[PDB]
């Protein structure tokens with residue numbers, strides 16, 4: 001069997017033996033209806049919900065409430081299984097919310113009003129999101145990672161009439177409202193009043209707003225639906241054929257703090273359903289997936305909407321910090337996955353741990369490795385993967401090879417952006433559609449030229465059907481992302497192998513010139529060193545005044561075990577050297593010294609984004625002083 005033949009053989013067994021997978025094949029009549037010319041965003045949703053009515057649409061983990069008789073506290077506790085809701089039931093919930101908002105006797109919502117949502121991803125989140133779509137309200141999915149000051153700025157700029165929040169974000173939400181922002185109602189969702197912690201947050205919100213003399217109505221999503229259940233059906237918002245109104249703002253920061261609201265019109269939002277991408281809906285692939293990325297990111301919206309578009313089932317991860325990710329994947333057994341490199345890291349770290357534990361005397365090492373990967377593939381990852389994509393950040397060549405040997409299928413490298421669209425580059429190939437044209441521009445100061453070495457290099461400029469028109473209420477910032485000829489400037493350096501074949505290098509702003517005149521690509525190198533078995537996380541740092549790099553390294557638990565600081569450092573240094581040799585790195589690409597950090601980078605401490613990407617500005621603010629001091633200590 002060839003590698004594709006192995007894959008096709010696994011897939012046929014699945015369609016022969018697995019009733020869940022068979023029952024979830026997309027219906028071509030539904031897909032054709034969705035694809036029809038003239039279909040607007042809400043018409044797509046309604047058509048999908050009607051076409052797949054009796055199928056399971058969405059799942060989340062079952063739960064129980066537990067009272068501790070010592071503390072007297074009642075706490076929600078997750079069970080190791082998922083429960084689903086049908087398309088019919090989801091759309092019914094959506095219709096209840098839309099009715100409640102449209103037919104409110106005093107202050108109803110109208111098309112074009114902004115609605116702000118503070119959460120992760122969940123059935124309730126999907127319900128609010130689709131209800132916005134139903135009424136043509138503009139969704140503003142706020143990043144849970146944002147600081148309150150940033151949230152206030154966003155709300156000030158968008159003037160939402162409604163703010164919805166999960167209990168754990170009620171602290172931030174109340175501060176936003178006490179600051180005199182525009183929302184008229186605060187809707188609490190993902191809410192279980194039987195949990196004492198959640199109930200206390202909800203009561204506190206209610207109390208604090210009342211005490212401040214706020215006229216905000218605080219209410220539960222369940223109560224909104226109860227209202228809507230006794231109101232007439234709401235109209236479905238369908239813009240006229242010549243109009244493409246705003247439907248969604250996706251806030252995105254880049255390097256520098258400064259969140260900007262990427263404008264997603266009705267047509268752009270619809271591509272999340274019916275689009276080109278591997279994981280968007282223009283496909284007959286069975287979509288059973290685990291949604292673990294927030295709805296505040298485009299990859300999280302695609303992972304939901306692209307699956308709904310194909311009549312599949314979207315399961316929502318229980319926690320936003322990936323701490324339940326593999327328990328969830330093992331239960332869901334998805335047919336498809338969008339990896340981010342941090343998840344690949346976790347799979348690699350599981351592999352290393354299991355391989356070490358099982359490499360006992362008398363183990364056959366020429367066999368064990370295969371068995372450890374088979375166990376990962378079949379059990380840890382569910383054993384039903386038909387396809388796998390990695391995106392959002394670079395994955396090192398060796399880690400890609402590793403992941404393919406575990407998955408035993410291709411790991412497609414998908415390059416895209418909030419500004420440009422998800423498709424753009426797939427396995428180094430320009431995707432047409434949506435790309436219309438592209439151009440490489442020289443960046444003399446970074447040493448990238450059309451006349452370069454084996455391949456032309458430079459900044460990628462593109463035109464695509466999926467590019468945003470600009471950022472909301474930011475005329476200046478908008479004008480700088482487009483050149484005189486209308487090309488979107490990606491900020492990304494690429495190498496052009498042939499026409500329509502491009503290799504991603506790094507962000508322009510990550511390209512660092514060392515003092516001796518060599519260029520290093522800092523995020524690319526971070527990815528390379530992910531392949532160290534001793535490294536849990538790594539941040540690479542350099543200064544153009546220096547001839548070498550430094551790093552902040554979070555070691556694995558096993559790396560730490562039974563080692564003092566000095567021996568840990570030498571072990572890390574030895575590993576870095578091996579990894580470097582394997583990846584054929586130049587000596588100037590190798591960190592010469594580093595800080596050991598035993599506290600991992602997380603969303604909670606501001607060092608990771610909501611999709612587990614290193615936040616470089618926050619890492620520089622956190623460690624920059626210590627790192628420049630290390631430079632100084634080494635110089636003296």
Ligand SMILES: Nc1ncnc2c1ncn2[C@@H]1O[C@H](COP(=O)(O)O)[C@@H](O)[C@H]1O
Pocket residue numbers: 252253254390391392393394395413414415416417418419490492504506507
């Ligand atoms: N497959 C990929 N490989 C490397 N970098 C990527 C990939 N996909 C996205 N990125 C990076 O992520 C940026 C988009 O970030 P955002 O719009 O915040 O999701 C791009 O401009 C790239 O720098």
